Amino acid sequence: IPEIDAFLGCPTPDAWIEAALADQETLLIDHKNCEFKAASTALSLIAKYNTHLDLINMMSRLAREELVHHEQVLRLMKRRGVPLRPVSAGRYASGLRRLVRAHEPVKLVDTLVVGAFIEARSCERFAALVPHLDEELGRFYHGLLKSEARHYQGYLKLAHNYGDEADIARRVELVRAAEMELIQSPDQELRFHSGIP
Amino acid sequence: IPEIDAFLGCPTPDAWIEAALADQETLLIDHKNCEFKAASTALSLIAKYNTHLDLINMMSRLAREELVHHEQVLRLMKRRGVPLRPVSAGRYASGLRRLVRAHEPVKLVDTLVVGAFIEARSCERFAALVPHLDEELGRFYHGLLKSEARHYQGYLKLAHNYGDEADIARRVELVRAAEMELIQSPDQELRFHSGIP
Ligand SMILES: [Ca+2]
Ligand SMILES: [Ca+2]
Ligand SMILES: [Ca+2]
Ligand SMILES: [Cl-]
Ligand SMILES: [Fe+3]
Ligand SMILES: [Fe+3]
Ligand SMILES: [Fe+3]
Ligand SMILES: [Fe+3]
Numbered sequence A, B: 001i002p003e004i005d006a007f008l009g010c011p012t013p014d015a016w017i018e019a020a021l022a023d024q025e026t027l028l029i030d031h032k033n034c035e036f037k038a039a040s041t042a043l044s045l046i047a048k049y050n051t052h053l054d055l056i057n058m059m060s061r062l063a064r065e066e067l068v069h070h071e072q073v074l075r076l077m078k079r080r081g082v083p084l085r086p087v088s089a090g091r092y093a094s095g096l097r098r099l100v101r102a103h104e105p106v107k108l109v110d111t112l113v114v115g116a117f118i119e120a121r122s123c124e125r126f127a128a129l130v131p132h133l134d135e136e137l138g139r140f141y142h143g144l145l146k147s148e149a150r151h152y153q154g155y156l157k158l159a160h161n162y163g164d165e166a167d168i169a170r171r172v173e174l175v176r177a178a179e180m181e182l183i184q185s186p187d188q189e190l191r192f193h194s195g196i197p
Helices: A014-022 A024-048 A053-080 A090-098 A106-132 A135-162 A165-186 B013-023 B024-048 B053-078 B093-099 B104-133 B135-162 B163-184
Strands: none
Touching: A014 A024, A014 A106, A024 A090, A024 A106, A024 A135, A024 B024, A090 A106, A090 A165, A106 A135, A106 A165, A135 A165, A135 B053, A135 B104, B013 B024, B013 B104, B013 B135, B024 B104, B093 B104, B093 B163, B104 B135, B104 B163, B135 B163
């Protein structure tokens, strides 16, 4: 398990930061939804792998942590007068999930590797953002950054628990390249994990 | 907020308790699954009603409480050597969901009333089981009673928040009738919410 910047294929582009700072409300609402989706994804993995007890125990606890984050973002939004509004999911997680192999057991390994990338990128991007944010939001985002690093390690360690070290290294190489492409490519919308607007 | 025996159309039949006691490992597995489905159903409502702030805040916290229950049952199965075996869902929750009207805003109100019945029945049924179980399981199930009553109250209170006292009384009367027949009808598989074997 390498360090975050080493694991990831590129830093967050300055142009993404610029767009994010100009629309922190869209950022916050999509961030709130992402925390919820992390919990919902963790539950879908429990349902899909109902006999993988190690997975089930980790995902149940992970889902609860992400639901806390979801509620914390909602409280921050309420404090700052950010109303709720429909914000469709971005392309990011769907693009990464297209690289998952369609057959067990490597389907599960690839799914967990994609999860490690989503959490690692979230940690890197929080870190890129906080020097530009106000004190309250930077403090909040700094706390979340630490949990993302833990979740990145947790996802990658679960993948090794179920996968061959050699196939994981090649899976990481494939998703790392596609992840970098999703992060550096032009994008039509601002999302927490969007490309360059 | 009526009392639980008053809210429900029927007590847990004695024949169901005798079946449950003769097959406590299946009961525990289905119970674990029911705690997970409660949290998963909670997250589904957040997804469907993603700008209803009151619903989203209550269901996030509810989902976390039910995942704690999910993990507790898992730890109890470990202590008692219950294998993680796939156990199909019962007919109960899906039977109740067929009564949900197809158009908003009464669609949401009906869904919340169904949630109230499921939690009220779980409370009634835990209470019926407790005096017959061993000490460890009896105390565990007794500690869940207070949570289920609270969840029954929460669902019903949420239905009143989004709906007219007229159509809620109308909905409660219809679901009560369908729920008691699900509980009193013959059933071909022991589940926590199954009918009579
Ligand atoms: Ca790098
Ligand atoms: Ca800017
Ligand atoms: Ca056994
Ligand atoms: Cl929790
Ligand atoms: Fe999180
Ligand atoms: Fe996370
Ligand atoms: Fe529960
Ligand atoms: Fe409950």
